[PDB]
Amino acid sequence: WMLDPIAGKWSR
Amino acid sequence: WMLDPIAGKWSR
Amino acid sequence: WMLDPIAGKWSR
Amino acid sequence: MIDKSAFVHPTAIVEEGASIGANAHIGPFCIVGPHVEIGEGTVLKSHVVVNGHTKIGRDNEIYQFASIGEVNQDLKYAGEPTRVEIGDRNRIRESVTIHRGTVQGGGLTKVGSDNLLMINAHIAHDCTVGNRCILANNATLAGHVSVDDFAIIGGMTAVHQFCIIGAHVMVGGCSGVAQDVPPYVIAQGNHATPFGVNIEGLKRRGFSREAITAIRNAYKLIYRSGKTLDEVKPEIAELAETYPEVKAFTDFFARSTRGLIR
Amino acid sequence: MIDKSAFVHPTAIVEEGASIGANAHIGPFCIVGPHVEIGEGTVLKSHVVVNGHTKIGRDNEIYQFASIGEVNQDLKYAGEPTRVEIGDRNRIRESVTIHRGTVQGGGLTKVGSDNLLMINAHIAHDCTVGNRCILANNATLAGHVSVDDFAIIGGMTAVHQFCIIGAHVMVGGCSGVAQDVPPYVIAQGNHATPFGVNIEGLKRRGFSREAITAIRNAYKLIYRSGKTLDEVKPEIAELAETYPEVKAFTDFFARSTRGLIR
Amino acid sequence: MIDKSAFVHPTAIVEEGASIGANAHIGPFCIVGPHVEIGEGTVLKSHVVVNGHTKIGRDNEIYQFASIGEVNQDLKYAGEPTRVEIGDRNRIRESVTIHRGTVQGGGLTKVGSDNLLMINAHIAHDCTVGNRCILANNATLAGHVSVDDFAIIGGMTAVHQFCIIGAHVMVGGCSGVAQDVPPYVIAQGNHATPFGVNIEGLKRRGFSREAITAIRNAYKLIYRSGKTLDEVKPEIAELAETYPEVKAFTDFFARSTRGLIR
């Protein structure tokens, strides 16, 4: 999965 | 109208 | 009391 | 090569290979890397770092403590020769960061012309910013984000990876944008939701009364009709046959990958 | 002129015309423009840009990567010789930005004395910051904002254009302040709303029990009585006849242009 | 002393007493104070300030406009010789600030190894950051904060003084963390609340199916059982007897001073 550190999430 | 870019608005 | 300027509070 | 009419401050470091245009100004303590091209009349005030494979247009003003073309923050990036392109007449303010692309994201971070990038605005790898945009203080575009023409992104707003901010959009301050924002829309909150049409923006930019009404009608189709997007797409395309400004919705729908803010 | 007792680092650039006071310290890689006045004992640590028509007082400490007196971010600004005034004993931290005024806004950005401006705090054109204030990390004052004495603005808080933050106010972190905040009030949220009186602040600053009670009573008139502001104004003025600390409300009401946070 | 294999740019200022390791690189316009130790292979790109009693490990990359070891923002700090320790292989991005400790807080700000500190991340006095963490753009740790191994703190998030962010935690962007976050938890909002277990993080870091289920069961004890923390502590300790990954909860409970986010 893609990490989006700015959003603070692992993308679903 | 006045733009407030920090608020992200056109002032009413 | 402790000031937390980042939180913007006086700590209880 | 450095044009004979360019000014390079004695304290600046311009590496051999850099291309500096006519009447450009490289201020004190700037660093310009060997793969950088700086266009005619562009000014680096002082304390600016520009590196990577980076092409900057004409008449830009880049303020102190900005970092342009730098290695991006993607953990996948491994030093590949990716690129930054910046157009003309941008005002790029103190501490702005514009990072190079990743191979995985297409190799290019792009910024158009006549933009105002306010203090500490961030343009991550693989973003595309159009023309006449405003990114307010601390506005942060995560990787792979598109910001279309005339869009205004409020202070401390973060746009999540892969999202599209449509043309003439107004994003309120301290928002978190997790999905795509259709053109002409006011968006606010965390996560950001729609709050009608940016009527004042359309007025100021010369949109006709008929165009604004049509745009409002398209907005209502998307958000008020109660129908799914697949149902309303042909209705919007139908409407665009009379009012060409409505075609912006169609073009946006074709690019949208994260669904619409609602 | 540069006072004989001032230190100017060999790498610093102080332009002819700048006035540098006794025992001031201009650190490495600083830039000081020709219209700048830096007062006795003021320290620019390193990598500081000070320009424009800018007067800075005594015993200030200005940290690296700060930008003081710089061209503001107002799209209306066109290079007019506007001003910045900064008082004494301010601690101005890394990456703080303080921008010059606009002609339209009165020509002056002003900061008082004994303030702490934390990392990346922003003071836009035409702001007025009083004395003994704290702006926490990334606190952002939009154009034409007033922050009165002793006010504390939390981390990542944005104050919208023209708003007044009253004396002894506490603004919680990550707030968005869209209207005026009466003195002595705790404000939080986006948009910010009131959460009672800053009792601890008043205690620490030597306010009497009677003064604090009166202030709480005034707060209740504004927010609990259910009356309009026009109704409660004379009641507050009446109360101020006995407790002079309450006059702060009256003085604030006279300046307020955006209405009160509620 | 400066190792013979270190590079120090002619424009850099390395003060006598600084210790610069083998194959380190001190870029243009950097300032390194006399109490600084910079380890083997560490790179300061350009325009970096490092001062105070500050020890930095091996193979770090520190980007332009970062301020490391600087005087902290605590109004109680009075110039005491407090410290910063930074480990190995950290990527410390543009405008990051890492401040020295206070005597009152223990005298030390500490950062481990293999961290990514994104643009304008702030590590205040007396913080302790572990290993393999990510602090996203504008992430702000107030004084005395602990961030445990593998934790990720989203963009524009503020962690309030004294709070603990547990191991493998995911904090969503634009959050305000006012209490302690147990290990393995997803936290978001202002004030931040829990939204289940960071399952994807545990997967990526090699946690077994059994360990993840046990962790989820512990989460349910804390947040779903309806019992108080004192009631569930021995139940969690009981569970940890079979699944040692659950012991992280126990160890965290012992350190927690501000109560748990709920």
Numbering used by the authors:
A (entry chain A), B (entry chain A), C (entry chain A): 1 to 12
D (entry chain X), E (entry chain X), F (entry chain X): 1 to 262
Paper text:
Here we report the successful crystallization of E. coli LpxA complexed with peptide CR20 (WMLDPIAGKWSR) at a resolution of 1.60 Å. Peptide CR20 is a potent inhibitor of E. coli LpxA with an IC50 of ~50 nM. There is a single LpxA molecule in the asymmetric unit, and three asymmetric units associate around a crystallographic three-fold axis to form the homotrimer of LpxA. LpxA-bound peptide CR20 is folded into a β-hairpin conformation. The hairpin inserts into the active site of LpxA and the N and C termini of the peptide is solvent exposed. Peptide CR20 does not disrupt any contacts between the individual monomers of LpxA, but instead forms a bridge between the adjacent subunits. Residues of LpxA involved in direct hydrogen bonds with the peptide are Q161 (backbone N) and R258 from one protomer and G155, G173, and M170 from the adjacent protomer. Residues that interact with peptide CR20 via water-mediated interactions are R204, R205, N198, and Q161 (side chain) from the blue chain and H160 from the pink chain. The most efficacious peptide CR20 binds in a region that would mainly occlude the binding site of acyl-ACP.
